Amino acid sequence: IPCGESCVWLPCISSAIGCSCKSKVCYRNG
């Protein structure tokens, strides 16, 4: 599920809420 954050050039600030970079945007479990 996309979280609402791009990660093309920086990692996910939303890593704190569980979101990780895949396919240039931040996701939690799809």
Numbering used by the authors: 1 to 30
From the article:
Cyclotides are a large family of topologically unique peptides characterized by a head-to-tail cyclic backbone and three interlocked disulfide bonds. This combination of structural features forms a cyclic cystine knot (CCK) motif and confers cyclotides exceptional stability. Cyclotides are divided into three subfamilies: bracelet, Möbius, and trypsin inhibitor subfamilies. Since cyclotides were first reported two decades ago, studies on bracelet cyclotides have been hampered by their low synthetic yields because of poor oxidative folding efficiency.
Since Ile-11 appears to be critical for folding of bracelet cyclotides, it was of interest to explore the capacity of this position to tolerate another branched residue, Leu. Surprisingly, the four [I11L] mutants exhibited yields from 13%–44%, which is lower than that of the [I11G] mutants but still substantially higher than that obtained from the native parent peptides. When the Ile was mutated to Leu instead, bioactivity was retained. Contrary to the [I11G] results, the [I11L] mutants exhibited equipotent binding to the POPC/POPE (80:20) model membrane compared to their wild-type counterparts. [I11L] mutants exhibited similar or slightly higher cytotoxicity compared to their parent cyclotides, whereas the [I11G] mutants had substantially reduced or no activity, which correlates well with their membrane binding. Overall, these results confirmed that the [I11L] mutants retain the biological properties of their native bracelet cyclotides. Having determined the crystal structures of wild-type cyO2 and hyen D, we were interested in definitively showing their Ile-11 to Gly and Leu mutants have native-like structures to support our earlier NMR chemical shift analysis. Their structures were solved using racemic or quasi-racemic crystallography.
